[PDB]
Amino acid sequence: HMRVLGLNGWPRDFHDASAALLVDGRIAAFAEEERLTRKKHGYNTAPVQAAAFCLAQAGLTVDDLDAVAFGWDLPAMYRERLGGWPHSDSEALDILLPRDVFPRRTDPPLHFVQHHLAHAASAYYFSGEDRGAVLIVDGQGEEECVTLAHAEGGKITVLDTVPGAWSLGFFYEHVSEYTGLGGDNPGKLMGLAAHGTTVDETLSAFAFDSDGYRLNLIDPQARDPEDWDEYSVTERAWFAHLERIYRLPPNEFVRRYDPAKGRVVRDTRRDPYEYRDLAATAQAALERAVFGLADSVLARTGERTLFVAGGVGLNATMNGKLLTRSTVDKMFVPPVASDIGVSLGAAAAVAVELGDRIAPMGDTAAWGPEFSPDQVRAALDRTGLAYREPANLEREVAALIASGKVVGWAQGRGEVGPRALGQRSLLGSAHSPTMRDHINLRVKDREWWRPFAPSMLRSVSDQVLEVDADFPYMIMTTKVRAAYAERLPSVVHEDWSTRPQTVTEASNPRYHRMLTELGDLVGDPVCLNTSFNDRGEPIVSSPADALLTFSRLPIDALAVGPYLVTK
Numbered sequence: 001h002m003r004v005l006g007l008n009g010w011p012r013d014f015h016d017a018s019a020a021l022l023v024d025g026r027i028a029a030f031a032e033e034e035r036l037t038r039k040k041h042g043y044n045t046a047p048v049q050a051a052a053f054c055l056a057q058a059g060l061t062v063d064d065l066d067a068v069a070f071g072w073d074l075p076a077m078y079r080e081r082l083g084g085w086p087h088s089d090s091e092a093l094d095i096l097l098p099r100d101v102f103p104r105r106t107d108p109p110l111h112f113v114q115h116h117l118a119h120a121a122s123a124y125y126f127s128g129e130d131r132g133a134v135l136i137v138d139g140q141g142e143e144e145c146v147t148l149a150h151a152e153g154g155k156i157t158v159l160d161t162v163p164g165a166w167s168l169g170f171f172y173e174h175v176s177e178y179t180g181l182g183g184d185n186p187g188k189l190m191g192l193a194a195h196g197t198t199v200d201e202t203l204s205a206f207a208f209d210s211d212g213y214r215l216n217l218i219d220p221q222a223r224d225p226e227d228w229d230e231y232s233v234t235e236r237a238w239f240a241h242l243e244r245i246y247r248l249p250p251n252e253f254v255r256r257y258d259p260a261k262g263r264v265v266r267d268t269r270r271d272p273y274e275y276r277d278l279a280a281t282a283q284a285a286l287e288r289a290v291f292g293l294a295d296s297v298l299a300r301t302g303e304r305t306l307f308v309a310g311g312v313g314l315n316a317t318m319n320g321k322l323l324t325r326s327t328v329d330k331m332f333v334p335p336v337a338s339d340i341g342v343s344l345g346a347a348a349a350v351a352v353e354l355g356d357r358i359a360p361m362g363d364t365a366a367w368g369p370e371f372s373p374d375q376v377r378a379a380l381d382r383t384g385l386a387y388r389e390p391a392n393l394e395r396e397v398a399a400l401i402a403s404g405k406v407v408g409w410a411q412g413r414g415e416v417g418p419r420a421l422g423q424r425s426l427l428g429s430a431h432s433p434t435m436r437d438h439i440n441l442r443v444k445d446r447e448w449w450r451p452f453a454p455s456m457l458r459s460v461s462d463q464v465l466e467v468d469a470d471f472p473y474m475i476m477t478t479k480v481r482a483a484y485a486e487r488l489p490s491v492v493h494e495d496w497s498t499r500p501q502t503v504t505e506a507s508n509p510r511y512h513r514m515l516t517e518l519g520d521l522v523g524d525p526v527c528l529n530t531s532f533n534d535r536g537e538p539i540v541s542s543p544a545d546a547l548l549t550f551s552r553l554p555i556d557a558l559a560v561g562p563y564l565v566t567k
């Protein structure tokens, strides 16, 4: 067997710590640090808990590993931006895998994988396609913010890159910050965009061309001498520019004691909804730029299959329009397009180099921890809530959903990536014209303008959606057929878009069975599926997490493992 532990996360200015374990090219385990620590975004940390879980899941120690792989060329970043890489592999391993958690007889081989290559590997090798065009777009790797590459014959060959100062990721983040939604919530900006109108998609900053874009607002070779990426340089340029060209100045954050909460809370001076037009315009600019890049690399490679990864790959709206594009026949974007995925991608790049073949991801992201009935019952008993073990859990949950109840659903291995996919989900009626406001305003406490997304049987997705293909990850939007756009109001957006999950019996028998039962009740085997967490907080992982959230929020029922708890 070849066993490779991929890692992301480092104590110095880092985010999205995660760990993935490949055994013979198959994913044995994969988790995000934030889900285990309950600290959102897994900032500034080696993936200690995620990696400990991976080893425990596979019954392994560090001594059983053929290699440890890290998803950045860290040594090169230290040499370039911080005056040298001070660590021996052994010292680096003591940081990535502290010995108090990871005892070891000796050091496994340590590999650093260039950041965009790791992103690329997480898309290509797990796609089930043997070749295609690679588009990597994020905030910034070691230097570049975009990579165009060719994936073929098991190799990934870089064709071109874009310098960090021209980052589409930084741009989008800075606009997000500017609106008051926050740089850490670009997904909110994506949601806001449909409520607004675009007049000038250049923002007087971008020039567009058939191969991508230009930003004469910033010297493309600008480098921050005081930091190790161009985040701060771009932030200043964008904030100055936006305040100059947009009718509203930056939205400011307000911190004030709230006597009803008994604590200082953070709010915004203006309602971010006010900036909806800027959101629409920023979204259109992003799409325009990426369409160019995508057309370019597809043409240069002679491929019609497109692989996308990097954080900008989380832009499901952009992905859905790329899919629709005349230059694209097939598209694969992994659930872990952000830095969450470079642990997996580093592991894959190394496993391939070591002679393994990588299995397709397979329409599932369920690789985190799962809990047996006994473990769940122990968390249940801890709380002293009454509960049942229904003879047919799936039927009862479907009936609860049909009646307009919101149901927590914590089953099997936790999802990796930012979307709940029927493992750690909050479920509600797709057919209810009030469910959307109820979950936003009452349950998860979100902005009224934020849309929800549906799960549905793959077997009916052709009838429901304007595109007939697998959508296993909720990472692409598409249009709902007019025949259903009115039947499924809670899971449709301002522009008749939806961000669906298609479910196969193979991928998730239980969820599949629940949806089937639901279809017998409401006509369509479709439900609202939002992630099981208070708005803002990390998706719940453990039975105790789920119970804490079930009890803090006005959720009607919780199906956790084989048990059902009702308020």
Ligand SMILES: NC[C@H]1O[C@H](O[C@H]2[C@H](O)[C@@H](O[C@H]3O[C@H](CO)[C@@H](O)[C@H](N)[C@H]3O)[C@H](N)C[C@@H]2N)[C@H](N)C[C@@H]1O
Binding pocket: 013, 014, 015, 139, 140, 173, 183, 184, 229, 231
């Ligand atoms: N607004 C107040 C906050 O701003 C910053 O955080 C912000 C980070 O600086 C942002 O950037 C981080 O992530 C980006 C990529 O998004 C990396 O390029 C960069 N190295 C890393 O710093 C990240 N994307 C969002 C986060 N809120 C500062 N850490 C201070 C404070 O916590």
Ligand SMILES: Nc1ncnc2c1ncn2[C@@H]1O[C@H](COP(=O)(O)OP(=O)(O)O)[C@@H](O)[C@H]1O
Binding pocket: 016, 137, 138, 139, 140, 141, 168, 169, 170, 172, 173, 186, 187, 190, 310, 311, 312, 313, 314, 315, 316, 337, 338, 339, 340
């Ligand atoms: N929905 C979205 N639309 C556009 N950009 C996004 C979206 N979600 C995340 N991003 C971008 O992803 C970038 C971070 O990507 P990632 O590869 O995870 O980190 P890094 O750039 O540090 O390697 C951020 O700049 C953020 O703006």
Ligand SMILES: Nc1ncnc2c1ncn2[C@@H]1O[C@H](COP(=O)(O)OP(=O)(O)O)[C@@H](O)[C@H]1O
Binding pocket: 187, 188, 189, 190, 191, 192, 317, 418, 444, 446, 450, 451, 452, 453, 477, 492, 493, 497, 498, 499, 530, 531, 533, 534, 535, 536, 537
């Ligand atoms: N069809 C869609 N079009 C555009 N954006 C969407 C669509 N569906 C969902 N979204 C966005 O996805 C985001 C998912 O929310 P998330 O970050 O998981 O928050 P929470 O913490 O409430 O679970 C929402 O903010 C919403 O804007």
Ligand SMILES: [Fe+2]
Binding pocket: 115, 119, 138, 139, 140, 141, 310, 311, 338, 339
């Ligand atoms: Fe990245």
Ligand SMILES: [K+]
Binding pocket: 323, 324, 325, 326, 328, 329
């Ligand atoms: K097409």
Ligand SMILES: [Mn+2]
Binding pocket: 418, 419, 420, 530, 531, 532
């Ligand atoms: Mn969510």
